[PDB]
Amino acid sequence: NSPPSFGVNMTLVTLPEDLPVGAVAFWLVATLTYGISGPNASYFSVNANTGEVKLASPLDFETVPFFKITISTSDGLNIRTAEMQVIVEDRNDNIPVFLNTEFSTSINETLPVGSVVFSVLAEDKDTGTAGLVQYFIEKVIPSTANSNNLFRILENGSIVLNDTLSYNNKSAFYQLELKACDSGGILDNKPKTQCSQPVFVSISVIDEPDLDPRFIREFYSASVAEDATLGTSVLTVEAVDSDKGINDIVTYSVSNSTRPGWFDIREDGVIFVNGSLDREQLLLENEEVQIQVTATEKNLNIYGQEAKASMWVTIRVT
């Protein structure tokens, strides 16, 4: 109930770095006129009579975290001085910054899930959680349920692939918008989190050979006279590479038929007379030959195998 018989004077004074110029930092009281001197005198403006001390130049933890001042009191006769230390406290006045605002990269569509796609780095000059950077994916373009599941970002700024890519069935391109925030702190005596400007990552997906070729038509038939000579054109078939970022050349072969030898095919899909034809032998089978054509890409697929497709063609003898 009875008050302490002493007070306590620290050798230091602690100011927050967001203390505005012209605010009162503190009052000097005795225990006459007061002053502040020495190389850091210009941080303060002292009222010599009242002891009122205002901040006269901005504080900044990032450059001058602490400094000394000399305080003086005078009774007219003698000036007594003491040194005082100023601790400047950090506040969340810096943002996370990246060195560029746009990035680009290419990735293979077979990139495995859990692979790092690209890494960004933002730095924030504050200390503590005010300096501790987190990353966020804000938007993915094109925006589909699937594009928003495709990529994810880690605390270190690495973007990881989270689902499988497809140049031909999903998208050849993505643009990700990101930001970086700090993990919060204080500014003007209340919570404050700072965020970066938006940044963009352009991703090109590279088409790899893993889709088989497809014939242009579900049906092909044609007719040929029974006396047609060796090498007569009958018809052209076409199959094309489903990997549209590749469009590998296709070749063809006759893999099977009713009447082996009667027809063959060139690399360019043209089916020709390759033997003596005979309308009379086909009177049982509707005067018709059925022929299986196989289309094969020139290069092997990603698994080191042939990329092929096949189908049957009907040909009318006369």
Add this chain to the structure above:
Amino acid sequence: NSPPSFGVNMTLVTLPEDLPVGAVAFWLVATLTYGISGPNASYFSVNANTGEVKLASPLDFETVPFFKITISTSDGLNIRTAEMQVIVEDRNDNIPVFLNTEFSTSINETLPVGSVVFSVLAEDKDTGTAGLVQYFIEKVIPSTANSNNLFRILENGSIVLNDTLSYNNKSAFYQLELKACDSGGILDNKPKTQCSQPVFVSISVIDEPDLDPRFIREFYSASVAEDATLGTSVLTVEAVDSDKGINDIVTYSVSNSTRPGWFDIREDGVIFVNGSLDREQLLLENEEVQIQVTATEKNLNIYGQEAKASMWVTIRVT
């Protein structure tokens, strides 16, 4: 050695938010009777004679981070007042909270490793590391060396798949227990970390068609008389889909034999007489026919191919 000739009076007072009601917050001293007035007067109780100031209502950084008070001194004749600011300091008095305590989801058993399975979010109202949420997987049920390797959790609350699933060979279901803690702070002047209540994630694994069918028996044989007519039942074989979450229908065909044509098989696994049989032709081969039966699932597997199995069957002619 000689003491400073001044003291220093700040314009503010800093209290921790866990200061208990009724504790002494501070003493007012001159430089008579003291008072506290203005809209925030009820935070304090002042002893007018001694200057003792107790906290009279709870402090709470989360709602009132700072506020002003008016302090007054009186000598009987005149009342002098000054404003004083109260900075309330954050302490770790909040826990990480999730919006529900149980979650459920389904995933395909072919989900690739490094995929996100499910994401939870906990929030903690404190600021700084006291507010910074970390996640933990506490338990996995069923508990095996393998179930505890299967899933892992990231700092953002995403549960990532770390090993491969199997509906049929591992488990159709998992239940994960999690918690969220903050990254520590101070409460009553010592370190304090806060944790959430337990939360649970129920995972259903979806069976996908990637296991071939299996015959019920390692051996099948039967007997048939040599004069048995076209279509006589001989025996039933059975193969079933190993994907037990699917149980796809199976069909059968005779893929090979000694004596092509003598036997065939129906979709329901029944092997029948499909030709004239002749005991005398088999006197060299133990009066026996061997037959290869192939079972094929009706739907294609995940890789777009036939799910098949085969075996040989012995049949005794008379």
Add this chain to the structure above:
Amino acid sequence: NSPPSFGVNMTLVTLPEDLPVGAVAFWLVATLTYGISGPNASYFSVNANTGEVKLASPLDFETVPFFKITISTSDGLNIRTAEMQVIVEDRNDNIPVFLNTEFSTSINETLPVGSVVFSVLAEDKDTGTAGLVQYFIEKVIPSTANSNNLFRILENGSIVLNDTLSYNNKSAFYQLELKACDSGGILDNKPKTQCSQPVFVSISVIDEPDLDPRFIREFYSASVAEDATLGTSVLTVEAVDSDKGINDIVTYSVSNSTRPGWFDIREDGVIFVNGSLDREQLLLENEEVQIQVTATEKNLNIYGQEAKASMWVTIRVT
């Protein structure tokens, strides 16, 4: 402009834990001689006349975060005492520590991307960001563009596989050097981040059977006289397992030829006369037999299939 008519005396004093022994902690002033007493008296050394109080024993937040002292003033006649609390503030004076400096583990080369390879844990005794551990991969040996893309580390200390392994085509071994730092704090009034001693993780990659066997030579031919008897050696071919961590045994079979039956091959690669040979029948085909040899590993590959390779061999009859 006119100074406040009171000062404010807190019941506590706050010191940073890096306050050096022998520095002035504070001055006691009245409101005669001063003293400090009670069980924690030895933390301070008081000048009884001047009120100068120096720190007399090291402060340490990690063991004694706060403690009480009794301060006394005497006028000769009576001694008045009050208790004062000392709050010790945490500073970043501890480093992240791991329990060992070297670790080792083995992983299968088919380990999927996004799998955890190994986990380390460092702990740092400080509180707040000064206690919050981050991990870094400093070096990978051997150092190639590819080895530095292979592994990545998460905030929880798990090393994740980021690209595909190969015992035979990349490396059977890696050594990773890591460190752990805290997330910064203050020491002697300025920012300070602490780092661990280096730690090493030795990774053995286990060779799995997923590469086919390869013949030693691109060409083999030999000669045999036309009257050579049943079982005469002609030549030895050799194929070996490309999985050099395995070196599975290989067997051979003749998969095809011009003149079926004339030659066969043993498990040890030796090709022998297996029929009556006849130089005269081969006068059209350059007195030569061409033979396809297939080499097959004894064990199935990781996908449950045969690991095979084939080639043609020419054999001169006389």
